[PDB]
């Protein structure tokens, strides 16, 4: 059995991950769980998976969790703080780490697992957006095995050749016969909407994700294709791909999750249901497979599969992301930060749907900062981008 520590175990990814171990108790053993302040869910997971440690990101939560565990008779050792999270990610005993702590808080714990040479199940896919160079370098200098969890990068991973799967990031694409990586996205709810109407779209309309449902923030990123922009940035880093080795394709049905084009003309693709348990189960079991609880894709109950090229006038964020990648990590993390501010603003009805792209671009222009050399530097750029975005949102709605 493989032992693991789950960074951000109470979130959607963590729960799905735990569902997978529940489907394969013999194969997986939970050594440590780390979360934020959701004490109630953490108690249940502790009582259900018997981890050696449980870490909350706060003293009040740790004590409150420690009280309920003992009241229930559990002997799980409780801890709190970022440093503890990092220790769990580096436990001598654990084989793989599910990195699901989103945002800046997930940076160091994920980095800690990389240096420890663990097998990383990268769910915190946004960390490559800010620390792409830092992370891939650390990955190569420790031989840690990266296994992308997000649906798109996972599909690509599965469609990639073995020599690349192992040595992910520091492997040569052209040398393994790979022509390009085909990143796919639904195009959002405003795929066929008249451009002239994009400015009047409402938060409710923007949050109607085409197929499956998800958070409001990630729904809007899907409508602006900023999510495809961030994933593009991540892919480049994760698969050592150039601009000419990347292709973005709209696929409304989202049956195909992404593909890889090969030298001889072949295109390999991964398909399935929109259940995160599939990519998650894939990474956990790699190089083998395990039951994930996800039902088999029924090809007789599918909508006709179509494709199309992304129109940049309709998705400026997508072009904006590609441009930032060429600009550097300072640009990508600023774009990410700004977008986080403008999307929240749009959702709070402070700005129009179309202002998201305009304001994201405006923040990038004003930035012009020194490429971060460490996480703390990444943090500063981020902090500076959010305030610039906040000011623009304010001077916009004023």
Ligand X SMILES: O=P(O)(O)C(Nc1ccc(Cl)cn1)P(=O)(O)O
C-alpha 341/C-alpha 390 separation (Å) is 6
**Residue numbers of the site for ligand X (CB under 6 A)?**
150-152, 218, 222, 227, 254, 257, 274
Quick check: 333 and 375 in contact, CB under 8 A?
A: no
Which residues, 161 to 190, sit near its own copies by CB under 8 A?
161-162, 176-179, 182
| Beta strands at 77-80 and 2-7: parallel, antiparallel or unpaired | unpaired
| Beta strands at 2-7 and 246-250: parallel, antiparallel or unpaired | unpaired
C-alpha 52/C-alpha 364 separation (Å) is 45
Task: Look at the chain and count its residues.
Answer: 398
Tell me if 215 is assigned to a ligand binding site: yes
C-alpha 54/C-alpha 34 separation (Å) is 6
Tell me if 37 is assigned to a ligand binding site: yes
Among 108, 223, 230, 294, binds its own copies (CB under 8 A): 294
Question: 46 or 149, CB closer to ligand X?
Answer: 149
* Contacted entry of ligand X, its own copies, Mg ion, none for residue 9, CB cut-off 5 to 8 Å set by kind: none
Place of tokens 């996480």: 375
Residue 8 binding its own copies, by CB under 8 A: no
Tell me if 265 is assigned to a ligand binding site: no
- Bond before 287 cis per omega within 30 degrees: yes
Tell me if 124 is assigned to a ligand binding site: yes
C-alpha 115/C-alpha 124 separation (Å) is 16
Quick check: 10 and 42 in contact, CB under 8 A?
A: yes
Tell me if 398 is assigned to a ligand binding site: no
Q: Is 324 exposed, middle or buried (0-12, 13-18, 19+ CB in 10 A)?
A: buried
Question: 250 or 385, CB closer to its own copies?
Answer: 250
Tell me if 280 is assigned to a ligand binding site: no
* Contacted entry of Mg ion, ligand X, its own copies, none for residue 266, CB cut-off 5 to 8 Å set by kind: its own copies
Residue 398 binding its own copies, by CB under 8 A: no
Tell me if 209 is assigned to a ligand binding site: yes
Among 307, 373, 394, 397, binds its own copies (CB under 8 A): 307
**Residue numbers of the site for Mg ion (CB under 5 A)?**
150, 152, 231
* Minimum gap (Å) between residue 120 Cβ and ligand X: 16
CA-nearest of 95, 109, 185 to 147 is 95
| Run of H or E including 184 | strand 178-185
**Phi, psi at 28, each rounded to 5°:** -125, 140
Which residues, 341 to 380, sit near its own copies by CB under 8 A?
none
Residues at the contact surface with its own copies, assessed by CB under 8 A: 158-159, 161-162, 176-179, 182, 249, 256, 259, 261-273, 275, 277-279, 281-282, 285, 287-292, 294-297, 299-300, 302, 304-309
Q: Which residues carry a binding-site annotation?
A: 10-13, 36-38, 124-126, 150-152, 186, 209, 215, 222, 227-228, 231
């Amino acid at each position: 059995g493989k032992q693991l520590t789950i960074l951000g175990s109470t979130g959607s990814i963590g729960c799905s991950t735990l569902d997978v171990v529940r489907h394969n108790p013999e194969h997986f053993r939970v050594v440590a769980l780390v979360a934020g302040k959701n004490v109630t869910r953490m108690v249940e997971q502790c009582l259900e998976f018997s981890p050696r440690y449980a870490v909350m990101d706060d003293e009040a939560s740790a004590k409150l969790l420690k009280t309920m565990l003992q009241q229930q008779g559990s002997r799980t050792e409780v801890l709190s703080g970022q440093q503890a999270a990092c220790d769990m990610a580096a436990l001598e005993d654990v084989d793989q780490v599910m990195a699901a702590i989103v945002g800046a808080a997930g940076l160091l714990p994920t980095l800690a697992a990389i240096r420890a040479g663990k097998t990383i199940l990268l769910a915190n896919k946004e960390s490559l957006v800010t620390c792409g160079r830092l992370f891939m370098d650390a990955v190569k200098q420790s031989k840690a095995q990266l296994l992308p969890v997000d649906s798109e990068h996972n599909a690509i991973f599965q469609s990639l050749p073995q020599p690349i799967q192992h040595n992910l990031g520091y492997a040569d694409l052209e040398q393994n016969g790979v022509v390009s990586i085909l990143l796919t996205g639904s195009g959002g709810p405003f795929r066929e909407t008249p451009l002239r109407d994009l400015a009047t779209m409402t938060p409710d309309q923007a949050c109607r994700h085409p197929n499956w449902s998800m958070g409001r923030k990630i729904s809007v990123d899907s409508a602006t294709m900023m999510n495809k922009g961030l994933e593009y940035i991540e892919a480049r880093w994760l698969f050592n791909a150039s601009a000419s080795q990347m292709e973005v394709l709209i696929h409304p049905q989202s049956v195909i999750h992404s593909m890889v084009r090969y030298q001889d003309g072949s295109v390999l693709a991964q398909l399935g249901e929109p259940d995160m348990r599939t990519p998650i189960a894939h990474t956990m079991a790699w190089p083998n497979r395990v039951n994930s609880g996800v039902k088999p894709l029924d090809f007789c109950k599918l909508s006709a599969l179509t494709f199309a090229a992304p129109d940049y006038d309709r998705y400026p964020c997508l072009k904006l992301a590609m441009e930032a990648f060429e600009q550097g990590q300072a640009a990508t993390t600023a774009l990410n930060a700004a977008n986080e501010i403008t999307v929240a603003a749009f959702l709070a009805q402070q700005i129009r749907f179309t202002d998201i792209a305009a304001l994201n671009l405006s923040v990038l222009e004003k930035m012009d900062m020194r490429e971060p050399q460490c996480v703390d530097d990444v943090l500063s750029v981020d902090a500076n981008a959010r305030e610039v975005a906040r000011k623009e949102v304010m001077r916009l709605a004023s």
